[PDB]
Design an enzyme around this catalytic site. Sequence first.
Site, PDB file in Angstrom:
ATOM      1  N   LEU A   1       0.814  -1.214   0.000  1.00  0.00           N
ATOM      2  CA  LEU A   1       0.000   0.000   0.000  1.00  0.00           C
ATOM      3  C   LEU A   1       0.848   1.265   0.000  1.00  0.00           C
ATOM      4  O   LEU A   1       0.357   2.348   0.327  1.00  0.00           O
ATOM      5  CB  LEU A   1      -0.971   0.015   1.189  1.00  0.00           C
ATOM      6  N   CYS A   2       2.116   1.161  -0.383  1.00  0.00           N
ATOM      7  CA  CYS A   2       2.995   2.316  -0.402  1.00  0.00           C
ATOM      8  C   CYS A   2       2.823   3.162  -1.655  1.00  0.00           C
ATOM      9  O   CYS A   2       3.425   4.236  -1.742  1.00  0.00           O
ATOM     10  CB  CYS A   2       4.446   1.855  -0.278  1.00  0.00           C
ATOM     11  N   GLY A   3       2.021   2.717  -2.611  1.00  0.00           N
ATOM     12  CA  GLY A   3       1.871   3.418  -3.874  1.00  0.00           C
ATOM     13  C   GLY A   3       2.788   2.826  -4.934  1.00  0.00           C
ATOM     14  O   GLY A   3       2.936   1.610  -5.024  1.00  0.00           O
TER      15      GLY A   3
END
Lengths: 285, 234
Positions: free
Chosen positions: A89-91
């Site tokens: 979910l860090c991009g």
Amino acid sequence: PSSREIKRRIRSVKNVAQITRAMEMVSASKMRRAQRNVLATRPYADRMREVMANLTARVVGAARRGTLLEKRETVKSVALLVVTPDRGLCGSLVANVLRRAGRFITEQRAMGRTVDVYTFGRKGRDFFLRTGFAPAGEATRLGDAPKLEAILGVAISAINGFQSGKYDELYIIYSEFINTLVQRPAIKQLLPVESPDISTTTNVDYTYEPGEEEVLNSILPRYVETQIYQAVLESIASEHSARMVAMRNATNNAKDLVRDLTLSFNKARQAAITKEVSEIASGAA
Amino acid sequence: AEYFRDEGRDILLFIDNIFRFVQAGSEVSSLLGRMPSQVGYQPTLGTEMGELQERITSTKRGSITSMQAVYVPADDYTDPAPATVFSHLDATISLERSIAERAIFPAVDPLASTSRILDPNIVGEEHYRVAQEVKRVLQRYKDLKDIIAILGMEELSDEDKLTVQRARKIELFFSQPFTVAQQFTGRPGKYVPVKKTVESFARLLNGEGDHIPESFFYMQGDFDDVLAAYEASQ
């Protein structure tokens, strides 16, 4: 289209938006603590850098430039340090750093040099295991505010492989914290070239009571270790900033989907009421 | 057309908007005093459609290769008129508004489209395999629409990332410029043979063309044209 399943979808997406807002604010808190840690750690490297500048200025003899000062010719084997987020979910940060590592490996193989990679964080380890090139040394489950002892487990291995001749050059790739909106990868070397912090602006001859060889042998591992620490801590700050931004975008997308699903649900309700009233009116007639 | 069929002539029937036949039936039935059924339609829409459609049949004397067009009211595919039309077909094609608005103008929704001759031993084993695999990867993208919209492409697994990228490249690659749509798409027409289509999609699923950015798959013929466009762009 049933006016009830759409209600369930709206409820679920609203829950998604709320949990994502929670993620965003906690990640903002972690990003701020990480930036504070970066600032606190900054003075140590800030001082060691001009120490490296002066020492490199003094030591000019190639023979006495041993240990990490040997610009060995006929490069064969090179080691690279990749630092990745522990969780997802860090991009696009992990995609960026892993693509950078991949092109690095391809370029090094183009020069015929074997490569070895040590992975910080589970994602890098898993990516390199799946690619089929097992990392030699991995240090996962790293804390949010790690101590330098955590990075020692990889740093000492890398430098031991360097001294023994197993690896000839050392590189590190990490998610550079350009800004809270952009976190691009950045390559750095760990073979002190001339310490270009402030070049040789300071010119004071020092006495080496341990001795030149002893001083360099003791300090260069420490300098590369603090460089690795700085890169890892910068990468942690970039990770938290990128997660915050990704969650902000995800919350906005969830709210847009809530609006779209509410419009669809409203249309479904109006159609259902029209069918209701039309059927009862037809039954009346 | 039945006279030419009875003599053995291979008739091509291009009846346009059979839904308007059903709608005219609905209007006149409403005037005629019949009780309405469902959304204001005539009670005898099933029988009317049967009477009209069953005359569109290939007979041992001669074959009618029919080809109809249908208008779904609003966009509701569950409307009674298209609903009755569906069961009278051998090859159903469903055009979606969402695909058309994206400028993929052939706009055929592969998931909702199908045919009876999509059988391994009628259209070829390779053709069947390619078509089914294309539907599978697409179906996967449809499942992952919500995750891709909210969480984004990055979160989902690498295998799913590859399948989603291939699915996007597919549904772009279904786009084609027709000879009759030159005034809208500046590109000329493309008469892609079925064999070239099967080979192109087999290659796309295999991996050949994965490096190509998805943009080059828009309005191209067989896969060779995509390769030529990419190489021209370097």
